[PDB]
Design a protein around this ligand. Sequence first.
Ligand SMILES: O=P(O)(O)OC[C@H]1O[C@@H](O)[C@H](O)[C@@H](O)[C@@H]1O
Ligand SMILES: O=P(O)(O)OC[C@H]1O[C@@H](O)[C@H](O)[C@@H](O)[C@@H]1O
Ligand SMILES: [Cl-]
Ligand SMILES: [Cl-]
Ligand SMILES: [Cl-]
Ligand SMILES: [Cl-]
Ligand code: NA
Ligand code: NA
Lengths: 557, 557
Amino acid sequence: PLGSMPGFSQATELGAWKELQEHHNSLGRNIVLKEYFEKDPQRFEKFSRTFANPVDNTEILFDFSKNFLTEETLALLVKLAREAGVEELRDAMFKGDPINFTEDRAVYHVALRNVTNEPMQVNGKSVVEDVNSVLEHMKEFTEQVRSGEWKGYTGKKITTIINIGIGGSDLGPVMVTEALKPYGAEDMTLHFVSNIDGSHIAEALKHSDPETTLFLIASKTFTTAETTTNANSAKKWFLESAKDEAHIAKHFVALSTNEEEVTKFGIDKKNMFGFASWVGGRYSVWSAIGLSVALYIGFDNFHQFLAGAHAMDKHFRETPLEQNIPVLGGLLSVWYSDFFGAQTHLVAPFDQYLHRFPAYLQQLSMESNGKAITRTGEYVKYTTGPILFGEPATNAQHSFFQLLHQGTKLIPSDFIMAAESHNPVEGGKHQRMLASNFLAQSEALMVGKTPEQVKTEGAPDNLVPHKTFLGNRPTTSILAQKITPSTLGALIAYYEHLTFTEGAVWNINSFDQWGVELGKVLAKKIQKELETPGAGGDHDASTSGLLLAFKKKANLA
Amino acid sequence: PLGSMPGFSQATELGAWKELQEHHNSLGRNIVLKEYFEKDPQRFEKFSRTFANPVDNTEILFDFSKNFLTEETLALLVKLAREAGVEELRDAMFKGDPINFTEDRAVYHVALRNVTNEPMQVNGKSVVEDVNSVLEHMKEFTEQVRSGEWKGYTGKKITTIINIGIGGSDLGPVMVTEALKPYGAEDMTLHFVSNIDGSHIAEALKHSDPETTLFLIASKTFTTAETTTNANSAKKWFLESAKDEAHIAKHFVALSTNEEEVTKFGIDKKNMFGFASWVGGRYSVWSAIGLSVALYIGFDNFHQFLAGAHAMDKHFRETPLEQNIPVLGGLLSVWYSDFFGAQTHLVAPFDQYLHRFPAYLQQLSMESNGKAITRTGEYVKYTTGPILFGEPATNAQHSFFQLLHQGTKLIPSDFIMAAESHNPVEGGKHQRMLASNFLAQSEALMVGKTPEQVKTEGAPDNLVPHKTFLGNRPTTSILAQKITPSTLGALIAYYEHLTFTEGAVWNINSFDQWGVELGKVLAKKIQKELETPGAGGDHDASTSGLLLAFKKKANLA
Ligand SMILES: O=P(O)(O)OC[C@H]1O[C@@H](O)[C@H](O)[C@@H](O)[C@@H]1O
Ligand SMILES: O=P(O)(O)OC[C@H]1O[C@@H](O)[C@H](O)[C@@H](O)[C@@H]1O
Ligand SMILES: [Cl-]
Ligand SMILES: [Cl-]
Ligand SMILES: [Cl-]
Ligand SMILES: [Cl-]
Ligand code: NA
Ligand code: NA
């Protein structure tokens, strides 16, 4: 049924927002971090938080103390969270209420990792047994493929997995298999095919054998333009060798919401791994979409990944806002975005395996919060989601940290590192050097280097400005024990709940994506024009000019 | 010797800047692209440019017409370029004058690709014969490795190349070998090791054989912390198998400015591929640093890559500002950054092989122009380089194009595509679909979709705002024939000269990087503290708190 009117319309109408604007005008805008640290030796104790991971029995330290925060600032941000009903929206999410108000849908990625089987329901029906049934199917199938009990059409062990999917059906599987590579099967090659660009499927198939390749067709809808075309091209390549369509049942499985479209494709109903409409693509790695992860690292490691997210769900659900870790991360994002004018958010993992973690967060953050319409249907009077970007450190330091230290933008930055490496090369020397950069970069961004310090080191007087570091550049530092499956699960859930918190304060829908439809509709029209002699003139002069140049260069009538 | 005072101090003091501010206030801020296209059927003719690539005999179309430009706007931006002496600084660069004013150095990447051997000189001495000598050495060495004439210590053909380097010694080689993969040797595996994180070298060595692995130690300085440690770990792994140090001469070569440090490392002087101090790292792929590219795709393809850059150098050098392609790209960046408040710049190649092209441009752009000090030593009164980011399309469309279409930021965007694929799978269907997305995304961002259009399609009245597209989101579209070596060379040179143009207008040094030194110095101090029992307390409370947590989690006294 229908529910209540929203608690508020515009974030800018909330009393706490107006107090934050007054706080910014008189105090927040004059925060100099190095002065706050000089005057407060308990600053780190005040603004750090420790999360217990009970799956691997470790702790993750979240240090927020190098942010533009005072006790007064934190009090006002938590007050804004209470006035915006962050806890109410959170509790509605966990109850399975349809908080996705533009699609009338629950938002229930939290049910996918409900490893304690707490009661969970959508539309008065429990979802727990169905979540568990798909997981038991994923368990059985992954054991058979990894053991070699599941065989190819000529009776060989599967050694190549090709995931075919785009956006939420690709970025999670890529990022998590890259991140957890140390746990991966030694004899298994993974390919992630996503782009419609034929270079992607071509390179994957070029070095694969139909006899030893299993395909995962990953599509919530099973009607995505890119994925259906890639799947079709994969099926033609397979049949070129296997000849017999009956063989498809040993080489193709489907990860989808849409049984009818899967069966249409020629996938055996028994080889379908389902997920519900209340699983958003950018929140889907926890579902059947994680099958490539469970194949690579095994079902038990996949389940520990779910369990680490579950521990962060419990922290988010039960912790008072003053100590709540994702909530503070989300309020800091609002503080920087809407009061300091920051258009970006850097995430730099000090970890090469996490090299696809920023790209994953870019979809989670930007597709969720790149929105301008409130629950009340008004255009926001304030900026919403930032441009999220990053690369792993120390690579990032040698690419664009120049601009972070000496450029003209405020760039709120999250640095993430594990204390222990899976590859402790040369007696730990590589890892102590990585750690020294993790510690030093946040230090350097906070303290800078004064003209007086530069002159003391012997710089030419007229080069002092060039070598000065203003400092006062904020950072959040996250120190884990080791990137295990459960630790990675908890880190993603942190960013999911930070993203939730931002959207709740902004009063937008974190869970829809209406903004992708126009490009899809216009691309289909243009594709028909490219296939049609003499067509393509019904556009603006630029689109028409580009379409004509493309037809001339590609030899199309 | 010493030269002249700078032509100006602050960009904001130039008459043309003040005319642009008045132009923005009265007209530029009210530009609605769809209205300008409705009223001007020759808009595309006015603001598109064609670059002839004489190496592959193709054309690259640069369409700027979906930007916030009128004839009056372009006239004022070109006027700002003349008042800022863009052509004077350009001509000084090509003459080998020391325009890198903070390091007293020439800026002579343009000499590296001087394929017509035009006279070129630094400090009254020709550089041409020395550039050509290194190239002839790169030619001879790459022929021997690729032919199998160069053999390993047990007489086998080299099949694995491991490049070890960071920033400008890594991102170019990675991006260019990924981009030009169709031209790459079928039997060759490349690894690019860059991160100090031991996971990077470990994964590369895990599946390599010392007998068939050649290492390229890529370092301008040959004293980078990460690269010396990685090189050292590579040498220990090699010697664990080869035992005899004499064998190093068949498995390790150096790409450096610093002969003394290379010989120190134990590399035979004959296996050193030199480049000059006037080659910046982020401008170095054209030099000896491109050796991994010439090994992979052959010397002739490498030389065509140089020649395509040379054709774009000639365009930049000889074209009047009204028609000059990189100049217009750089002025648009100033226009958006300093008059519309855009903090970001999206680059989305509609090309999976170009998947590392945005990361390459991120270093070029942000390390060059992430600067705040003028030639006159003042702090800029205006923002400088943007945050540059991106991912290949169509992947990008399914990740963050939601925010580009419906979010609250202005994001100047460059879309790049080739008309022809190297992998024309399924009779060109993948490529026509990719092209349809390239054309449609810029169309969609410009025209949007009105509330009236949304209601016509049958949307619930109270969902109309959620499904509305405001449009008026600018783009630059770049359509090449095919990503050949020379076409890629010309595209990079475009971005190098766009970057030059931005820095010339802003009156900053595009060519120094003082902003990386503080982090390096502070990391070395912390590394010594990590190695020293009881040390690490002499920091701010956050750095001290993180360092202590790291020592507890990593078991360090
Ligand atoms: O998994 P599907 O139904 O093929 O959709 C994949 C992606 O498609 C895109 O249009 C959306 O931006 C994403 O939310 C989604 O993840
Ligand atoms: O090639 P080298 O001397 O090892 O330096 C590599 C990188 O080092 C970094 O400090 C700089 O940010 C880059 O400009 C440079 O490319
Ligand atoms: Cl305080
Ligand atoms: Cl990188
Ligand atoms: Cl005009
Ligand atoms: Cl991607
Ligand atoms: Na675990
Ligand atoms: Na060429």
